[PDB]
Amino acid sequence: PAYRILKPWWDVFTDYISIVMLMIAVFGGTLQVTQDKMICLPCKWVTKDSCNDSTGPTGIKYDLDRHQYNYVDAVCYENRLHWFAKYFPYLVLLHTLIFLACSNFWFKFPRTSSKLEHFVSILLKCFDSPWTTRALSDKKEGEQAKALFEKVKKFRTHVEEGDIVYRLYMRQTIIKVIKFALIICYTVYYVHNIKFDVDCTVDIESLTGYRTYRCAHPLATLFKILASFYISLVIFYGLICMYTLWWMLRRSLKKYSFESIREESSYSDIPDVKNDFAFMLHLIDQYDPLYSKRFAVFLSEVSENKLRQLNLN
Amino acid sequence: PAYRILKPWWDVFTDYISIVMLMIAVFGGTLQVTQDKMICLPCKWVTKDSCNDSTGPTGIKYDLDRHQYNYVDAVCYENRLHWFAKYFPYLVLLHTLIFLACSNFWFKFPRTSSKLEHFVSILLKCFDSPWTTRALSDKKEGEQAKALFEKVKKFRTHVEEGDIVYRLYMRQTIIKVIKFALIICYTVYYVHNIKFDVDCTVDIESLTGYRTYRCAHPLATLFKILASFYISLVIFYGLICMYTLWWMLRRSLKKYSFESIREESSYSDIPDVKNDFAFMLHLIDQYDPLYSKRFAVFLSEVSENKLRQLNLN
Amino acid sequence: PAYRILKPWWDVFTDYISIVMLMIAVFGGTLQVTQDKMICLPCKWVTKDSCNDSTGPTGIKYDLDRHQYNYVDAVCYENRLHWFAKYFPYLVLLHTLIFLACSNFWFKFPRTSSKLEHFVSILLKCFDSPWTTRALSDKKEGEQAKALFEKVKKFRTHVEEGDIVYRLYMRQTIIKVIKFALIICYTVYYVHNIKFDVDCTVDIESLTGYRTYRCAHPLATLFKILASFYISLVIFYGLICMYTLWWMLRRSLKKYSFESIREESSYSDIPDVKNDFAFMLHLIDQYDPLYSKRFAVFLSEVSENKLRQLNLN
Amino acid sequence: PAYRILKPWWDVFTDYISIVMLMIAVFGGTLQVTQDKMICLPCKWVTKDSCNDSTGPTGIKYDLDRHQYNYVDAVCYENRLHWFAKYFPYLVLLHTLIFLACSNFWFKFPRTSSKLEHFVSILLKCFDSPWTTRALSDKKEGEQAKALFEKVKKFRTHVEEGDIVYRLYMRQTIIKVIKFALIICYTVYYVHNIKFDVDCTVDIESLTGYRTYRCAHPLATLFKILASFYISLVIFYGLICMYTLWWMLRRSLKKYSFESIREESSYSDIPDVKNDFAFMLHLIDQYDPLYSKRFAVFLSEVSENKLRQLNLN
Amino acid sequence: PAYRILKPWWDVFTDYISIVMLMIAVFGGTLQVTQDKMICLPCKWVTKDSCNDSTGPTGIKYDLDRHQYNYVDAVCYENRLHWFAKYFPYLVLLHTLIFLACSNFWFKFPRTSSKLEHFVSILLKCFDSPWTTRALSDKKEGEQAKALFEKVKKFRTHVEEGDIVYRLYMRQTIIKVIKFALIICYTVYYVHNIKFDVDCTVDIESLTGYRTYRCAHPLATLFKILASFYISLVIFYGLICMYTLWWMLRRSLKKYSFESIREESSYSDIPDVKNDFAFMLHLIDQYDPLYSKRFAVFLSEVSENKLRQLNLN
Amino acid sequence: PAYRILKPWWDVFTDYISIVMLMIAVFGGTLQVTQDKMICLPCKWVTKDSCNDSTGPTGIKYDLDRHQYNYVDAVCYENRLHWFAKYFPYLVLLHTLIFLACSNFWFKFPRTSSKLEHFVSILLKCFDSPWTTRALSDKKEGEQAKALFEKVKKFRTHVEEGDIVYRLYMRQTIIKVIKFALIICYTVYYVHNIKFDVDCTVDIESLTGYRTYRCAHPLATLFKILASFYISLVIFYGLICMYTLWWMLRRSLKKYSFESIREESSYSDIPDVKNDFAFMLHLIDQYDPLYSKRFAVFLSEVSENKLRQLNLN
Ligand SMILES: CCCC[C@@]1(C2CCCC2)Cc2cc(OCCCC(=O)O)c(Cl)c(Cl)c2C1=O
């Protein structure tokens, strides 16, 4: 619908950071399932379960076929390779899906979807009411206008009693910021774990004839870039959601301060909201202060009284 | 159409869990048909039809080509590998298609599609009727309004006699919950069956020269993750549909209790529904209690009588 | 357009069974063209043109390269493999395309497309006529209403003379049911023909040096599942179209029985249809009995006469 | 736009036959570029530049590597394989594109696109004119109606002078039928040319050491099916366009016979068309005879005169 | 938008020739990046840096592995293969993108996009004005009509002063025709350069042991077809744009000749255009002469005067 | 929305150059991940850690298998190949995403998205106001017109106080031009770094037996083309954004010069804008000077006064 109004900048940036994060997850994964192989060779001279590194030169002959080179490639890939190298692209796609859910859960949950759609529906009618132009400074619009005064007066009490919307948005960002804290905790802790050269000692002499091998994961660099890119993409994500958390904890959005628009418009009799109609009003003010300024007229009694006198006369 | 109104939260969560379940089925399957191979080697020293595991080291020579390594890879894949490892991604896609059908069967079946579309069609007109604003607290809308009083009075009897809708939704969830009970029964029972190292004794010495071989299914881990993920995705699915089953068995949705909206609105003469018009009314109340509160006016006689006096005068 | 009205449940189920049938045909085929290979080995000791099956063990050496292993793989695949294993996915896609054509041929053929679009066009206007509400129990709608009385009176004779629509729907299902009878005849007859282990005796000793070989079709199981799934998907298809055939042969849909709606509505002067306007009326009654009940008013003479008196007065 | 009206059944069937023809061309081609390889082996004993076909058995050793097996595979594929086996899928896609162009050229050419769009535009207004209902058996529609009488009288002369439309449709089908005659001429003539077993004598002993080889094209069967399917798909195509050619040569569509609709409607003063407005009128009659019957009223003078008297009085 | 009006036939054919040209570029390229390999063998006996071509036969043994067959395949592919064989599909895609840009640059450039959208906007209103029907042979349309007389009188001077549109279309085709002249110059000159059999003398004896090799580019034929098809597709393109160049150089489109429509309509006082409003008027006349004939009325003074007298009286 | 109005030609060209730049990045990358391999051979005679290059000829035998040819291919690819050859396609996709963000950031940021949507919304109403036709040379449009005079008078002060829009467009191009300066700095500096023949000395004698190898990157040419194409594509990009930077620094767009439209229209009392409403007005003038000329009437006082007298009388 027209839900762009309810997405501040801190949820517009985040909506795109949660796409590029998806692009590397689906790119790293399709690359992984595509090849993600290991090239493993034996080491004739072994010491400490490691390669000892002990006319014209000739090649070395291990006497192995292509099929018992591939066996050891799999064994040394399943056992002696770290889980974070193999399953990383599938892991950051998971976390991406959480971030996409934790921002659209607000809209899809029906107890809050109705209230939001109720709020945007009256605002566009309030925004598109011709009569508000006369008051911010005929008869058909006046009856259309009083029709909107009443439902707004019912909307003023229908939604104001419930406080679910401010809590979801409060319990959506606060877990997103807890989520970003855990990603950076382990991801940086295991990013060093992946590397190109890996040794494996898998204990198969009955099949091949060698105990230790030396492997070479070629995608170790290309993943190390994406993880270093992913962490840097998430830190910018985390600071965004850390700011909106602070904003929701300092400004005290439960109660709205409507004394400024009444200061200059000479409408002393305008009520101040208590809870959960202030917030969504505090939110759309982030978009612009115009949609609330056009709304201050439908919520005053003398403005209704002036319409009533014009409607009486 | 506008059928979002008829989907509670327990069918909104489930609509997305039935997509991620599809994503792993189509991902596990395209991965399966892609490679899903086995690397099988012989064992020179055999005991109990198993590998006995009995200067510088050299490779072992079995004297086999690439084509009779691939033959044994297929035989040991078709016979001595469990059916649940090969056909798992095709199996959870089947179950997914059932869950998608068992929730849209409600909408597509014509005996119930008409009634539902009949219910949403009058509600939006009831919701968008300007006259309801006057009554919840001119002449053209009154005739438009009485036009809606009559069809609602016919709708009150056209649908109320049949009880098919409440039974489909009752026979859709109750088999879905029976379905979730069987998935968890066998899936956990065979998830241990898949594993990386598998031995095979296939009885082909005329072709290769060896009796027993040792194989290595490399995707055994990656599938074990998805199955452990699938089971955990289904248990959250099952508890959802277990709750809506309880809800439909405790609240007694055949009869609706409309005595609350009349308590405060001063409309004593409002009838109570008997069957199959209560339910769909009990359902949209889950979305919000506003669409039914705006509907209580079109179903009362004095509200029609007050319109009639305004229409007479 | 709005042709959902003209599709009963027995053509809604069938519309989806004809998609999953397509999914396995396109899945079996892309899988077939992808690999569909055979791994064929010789047999040194042959008896009856079959494999005779006659310190540490060593591999057997046939002295063949990769290119004369692939030659015999093709020869034993083209000749000594059954045609039903290779061309099955391309065969059930054909049959699927017939089933999709034999149900949309009704709509695309212009001699019948016009009549159907003529029928749905007046019904929605009959359904959306405000005047029908007064009669089922002002002046502008009355002229709009009489405008519809006349074209319906011309539609009553324009279409009633032709009988093409009832014959197409009669000649569409009756060949579909003849089609399902032939599919089950041969498909079950050749489903046993496909199997994993197949022997081939292709008579090429000048090239390889061996007369007989033993092959291994690995997809033999995976196709045997789809065919067993396809047959089970078609039997449910066939019973659907066997029921609608019986329905069209027992109820005698050429003549409609309109004596019920007139029994309670007190409209004795309502005509009974003869052919090809009864059927499409008998069909939409399957959707709901409401679209015909709202239609009984535009087809009566006294209802026109009562409008005429209201139009005269 | 609404150009379904101008497509008879013989151009509705053909519109779908020209899609399945495309499906095999794009399927045969993607299959061709995918593999389309040849497996070629030498023949030690040669006679007439052909394979002479002259304890336990052992494999034959030619002493060749994988890279000089692939060279001969290409040489024997480029030279000693017929051009119709390699380039068939690219050839029937060409012919398909012609058939799609030779039926939409009618619509895209601007000298004829305007006339057709002019014809469908007045017909829907003639079809949707409320006044035609009164005449086939008020004041605003009468002026709307006379507004349409005049442009139709100008349309009667604007298009009738030119004859380009009847010639394009005459020069579109007559070359399509000439095209179908050539396809069947050569396609059947070379369909036998493709086959599985092909010999090649390419004269390269300096590189490999053998003069003659025996090859095996594995796709020879699968293409032989598609060509036998393509020819059978085109013969049904050709008979369609052979019928519409006969129809356009027997009925004499230059002049329309409008004496039937005037016979029963009692409108003696109705003119008969001469050229290129008869045809498009003769065409839409194929769809239904109703759009022309509703059109006979706007083209008569007394019908205009009766409107004029109702407009005068 | 509705810019089909501004595309004559010589830009409708060209719009489709510039798609099939794209289809072979994207087909030749995806085929190229897919395989585009070379099979290269040595020649033991060399003369003039070329292959000298000097009981049962046996294969020749060069003693090379698969990895130093692939090295020479790349060296003889990068150096001793012509640049036109490798980069041809990427080259004709470039030229295609120019042709698509050189025909939509007219529409996207804002100095000319506005004028064109201004011209089509008034024409449809002129075409859809009911009053033009009376004049080509009431009060609300007259004021709507005079509203259009004035903006057309301002449009007559707003656009007529600038001449950018006629120069872009003049400088778009004249470079397209210069472009077609260069394509045919070099493409035919290098099409012979590609061929199947290519020799290479790359000077690597330290690695392989041979000086000269003989290679086999297998796609040389399939590209030779596309280039011969591309050249034949461009010559038909070039003659199209050579004709529209001549048309724009013979007819003198700067000044329009409006004396024909006034000859028969009896409107002597109609002005003749000078520049850049004649052209776009000369262009839409190519579509049909009807849109200009309906336009001659809004541009005459007595037609405005007759409206003025009807507006005065 | 209708944001084509706010994109001059220097942001229309750039919108397409930023697509072809994307096409080579996604083409170079999918090509890279596809193969991007190296063919590496040893050198028996080494000097200076480089290949010394020291009857019938025979092949050279290094005694290496396929698996220790692939190991060295990876080691010599990860270490002794330049980072700019491997990661180039992923690098120019990054820079492309910046250029796409740095031009749509203007539109997506809500503090500026509202102002722009506010500006285009009144302009189309100003453009589509019928009354402007009378003034540039009835009663309902006059009230519709005065309704627009007031909001424009509020829009004249609502947006004029803020200066964010002119700074974003100033801080978007000035960093884009700083970005183009850095691309050309390093890209040309490392484009020579990629090449076909590369030597590697990786210090693995324990595994293979050779110290130095000679490799062959086959894609070195095809990337050198794209980079030379990318640099040439960016230089045309950079000059575009260098011109719009100069334009924004010479014309002094903070203040608009509205004295020309008033010179000829005889409206002396028209105000001159100060900041941030001049710019967006200076911008749409680039599209055409007509949208501002039609706007000069809604911003004058006597034009409102003349409407007021027509509204008073
Ligand atoms: C003559 C020495 C025997 C060893 C092998 C054996 C002899 C026959 C094969 C094994 C190893 C190998 C590996 C090869 O590459 C596999 C690419 C498969 C694909 O295309 O995916 C090729 Cl070509 C060759 Cl000749 C060879 C050999 O010389």
Author numbering:
A (entry chain C), B (entry chain D), C (entry chain E), D (entry chain F), E (entry chain A), F (entry chain B): 15 to 68, 92 to 174, 233 to 408
Task: Provide the authors' original text about this structure.
The underlying channels, termed volume-regulated anion channels (VRACs) have variable selectivity and conductance between cells, but are similarly activated by osmotic stimuli and blocked by small molecule anionic inhibitors including DCPIB (4-[(2-Butyl-6,7-dichloro-2-cyclopentyl-2,3-dihydro-1-oxo-1H-inden-5-yl)oxy]butanoic acid). LRRC8A forms a 565 kDa, homohexameric channel with each monomer consisting of (from extracellular to intracellular side) an extracellular cap, four transmembrane spanning helices TM1-4, a linker region, and a LRR domain. The N-terminal arginine residue of this helix (R103) projects in towards the conduction axis to form the highly electropositive selectivity filter of the anion-selective channel.
Masking out the LRRs and applying six-fold (C6) symmetry resulted in the highest resolution reconstructions: 3.21 Å resolution for the constricted and 3.32 Å resolution for the expanded class, respectively. We attribute this bi-lobed density to the DCPIB inhibitor based on size, shape, chemical considerations, and comparison to apo-LRRC8A reconstructions. The density is well fit with the predominantly hydrophobic indane, butyl, and cyclopentyl constituents in the larger lobe extracellular to the R103 ring and the negatively charged butanoic acid group in the smaller lobe adjacent to and below the guanidinium groups of the R103 ring. The R103 ring electrostatically interacts with the DCPIB carboxylic acid while the bulky hydrophobic end of the drug is too large to pass. The upper gap is filled with three well-defined tubular features that are modeled as partial POPC lipid hydrocarbon acyl chains. The presence of these ordered acyl chains seals the upper gap in the channel surface and may act as a ‘glue’ that connects adjacent subunits and stabilizes the upper transmembrane domain against movements in channel linkers and LRRs.
